[PDB]
Amino acid sequence: SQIRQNYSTEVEAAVNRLVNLYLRASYTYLSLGFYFDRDDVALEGVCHFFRELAEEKREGAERLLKMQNQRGGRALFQDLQKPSQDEWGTTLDAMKAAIVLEKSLNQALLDLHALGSAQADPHLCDFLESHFLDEEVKLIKKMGDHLTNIQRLVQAGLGEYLFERLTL
Amino acid sequence: SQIRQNYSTEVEAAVNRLVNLYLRASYTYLSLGFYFDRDDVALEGVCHFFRELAEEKREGAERLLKMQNQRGGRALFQDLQKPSQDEWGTTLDAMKAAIVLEKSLNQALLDLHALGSAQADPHLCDFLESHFLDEEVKLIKKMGDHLTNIQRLVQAGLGEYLFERLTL
Amino acid sequence: SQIRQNYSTEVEAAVNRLVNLYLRASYTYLSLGFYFDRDDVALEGVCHFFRELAEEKREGAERLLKMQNQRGGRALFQDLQKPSQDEWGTTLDAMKAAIVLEKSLNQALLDLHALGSAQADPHLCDFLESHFLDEEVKLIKKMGDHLTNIQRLVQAGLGEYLFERLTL
Amino acid sequence: SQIRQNYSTEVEAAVNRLVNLYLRASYTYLSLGFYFDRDDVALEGVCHFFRELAEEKREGAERLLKMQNQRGGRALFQDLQKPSQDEWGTTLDAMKAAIVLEKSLNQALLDLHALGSAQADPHLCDFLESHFLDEEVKLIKKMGDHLTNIQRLVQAGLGEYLFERLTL
Amino acid sequence: SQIRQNYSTEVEAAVNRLVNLYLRASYTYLSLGFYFDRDDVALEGVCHFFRELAEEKREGAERLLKMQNQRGGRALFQDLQKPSQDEWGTTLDAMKAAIVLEKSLNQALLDLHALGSAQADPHLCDFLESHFLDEEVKLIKKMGDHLTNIQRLVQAGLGEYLFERLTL
């Protein structure tokens, strides 16, 4: 590539893998959102919380793909595996699964950052720091806060309703 | 009728029956609304929910009557039977009765649509699709969502109060 | 499902399959868009055309999923297969592949409509007519118009540049 | 210097060298810009593209000089060598020379970043990441995109005219 | 007719013939417009040019009919013959056919003017001069200008595209 400079094949491949992970996360949140939209679940605030996160993760994937091209790397797409569950249980179960998912994404970001540092690729390192690392930390804090409030509240039915009405 | 075209006597009669069903539904919701306005019931949000539905069903009847005339059919009115109950119990009981009522109206709309299709009357079919069928589907979804939230909430007194305050 | 009425298991399954087809189409257009963003391809108008279509197809999938829930059906997600190509060649090649993809989606919509008609499900039939069928017809017309103009223009390099600058 | 802290003589010297490189780049772009303003060249969009870049590179030099003083280092200026060419040939030749120049600047920024990291000078590292590294990556991507479009277009005279009119 | 004054049967008949000629011209331009809207032709600017002319010619017919009544003559309508072609070939072919059509209309206007002069009917003469004769001269000039530019441009495919994009 005429523009490619200081951009290792290892980082290029890892960025494609991270795109897949972000799209998979978006898909998982799409599934979560529509599950809470079921008439036998019916927690609209929880549905909206996860649909927003689906959009965020898709946007993160697109930012990665834009960066791949800016550096002269080549986007390669793989199958997107379906989410791990078809039904997501309670808001508590769903929020635990979301924090698991975000921690996995954060770990992938940290692994890529370490790779970038080992490859002396400061543009990559700054990109991740600037657009992804703090967003993950803030989101995980928010989920942990939500989990604590959900747990405090669970008369589990009343608790789930109040959390959805008064927090989300 | 000088304007009547492709409008079968069977559809004409069925449209008059559906008008009666919609007015009956309006009357039922009028009864539901004022029951929740009783000082010994006193759930204003539930009263407002059903009074709004009374207005919607009356409006649906009027739309049917306007259509009857547009097609050159002749409106014929029958007695409006009183609602099935004088007292409607809890918000849960009332919402179950409302979903029963809406499903019966929806089934009548679907029967009329099938009639219209058998009579090759696409204006009727489009009219129903455009003004009634999706409105019923959306309303039934909303009632089902309400029922699920009511059920989750029912300390049944506290639950009924919170639903009325925070959802309705 | 408490709300489910006149909604066959066959339509429910077909709606889940159509969701997968729309998400796959979105993914294909995401791939198309970023390919035209490559520094060795560099046709920004073509990139924007396909990124817009990615968004449209995702939105169509979400509309289907919302409908699934409104009817009381249950969303089931499957793996999303990667797009058929990693590199998409010329704007001409890409627009031919897009018209192939849209025709396949349109055929799936028509198959589902026929199913809905056979199952006497007019809500489904109206839903498809109202939100999908005319959008597909308009989009295919636009692509065909684009293809004709691309073909007229292809000094193939000059042609591709002018189309991107003056049409897109 | 009373304020100097964690600022190595090696970085101080390298920052002065980078100032010279940025001023040299500004001078090169000044030459490029006025060449395209010649009546026997006459490509105003190309002239404007390079005059803008002259300003950008001068501004980058000034930002470096401001930083030098903020850290307590001492600006030292050297002769500014004249640009490598007196006449710059075609827009294609000029854009190739510009990408060569930007890659050399980017490599100098990366070398300085590596120096800063080896000297454990995170302020320097952040400064470069924040103000220079991403700007270079974006600019090189844009030049590469321009080069690809120029190449696609070159009836070379017609191509050069159209690029200047429709892209620049 | 109580109002009829200085309005010969010969002019009355000729005005009815000219109405037919203008409606025929409108129909021809309707055909031209939709031909350029075909997906295998796809020149939207050319389609718009001819659809506008269809409207102009219809309006001219209506102005003639209004005049017929103002003078106390009696509008008589004849069949409108279909346009001379089903497919109109290239923009060049179409613009040549349009100039042929406009010249025929102009000649009919000039013949009617001569008739009006021979019948000493200055109202008719002024009407034609004021509303039709200069409009035809301007339109024919514009078509001739278009033809010259089309001809200059025809790599005939590229030429047709550029004319549609940059002139129409």
UniProtKB/Swiss-Prot annotation, chains A, B, C, D, E:
Signal peptide range: none
Top-level taxonomic group: Eukaryota
Kinase recorded as keyword: no
Function: Stores iron in a soluble, non-toxic, readily available form. Important for iron homeostasis. Iron is taken up in the ferrous form and deposited as ferric hydroxides after oxidation. Also plays a role in delivery of iron to cells. Mediates iron uptake in capsule cells of the developing kidney. Delivery to lysosomes by the cargo receptor NCOA4 for autophagic degradation and release or iron.
GO BP field: intracellular iron ion homeostasis; iron ion transport
Region named Catalytic site for iron oxidation: 52-59
Major subcellular location class: cytoplasm
Record-linked Pfam families: Ferritin
Family membership noted in the UniProt record: Belongs to the ferritin family.
Keywords of this entry: Acetylation, Cytoplasm, Cytoplasmic vesicle, Iron, Iron storage, Lysosome, Metal-binding
Name of the featured protein: Ferritin light chain
Note from the entry: In horse spleen the light chain is the major chain.
Gene: FTL
Record's subunit section: Oligomer of 24 subunits. There are two types of subunits: L (light) chain and H (heavy) chain. The major chain can be light or heavy, depending on the species and tissue type. The functional molecule forms a roughly spherical shell with a diameter of 12 nm and contains a central cavity into which the insoluble mineral iron core is deposited. Interacts with NCOA4.
InterPro entries: Ferritin, Ferritin-like, Ferritin-like_diiron, Ferritin-like_SF, Ferritin_CS, Ferritin_DPS_dom
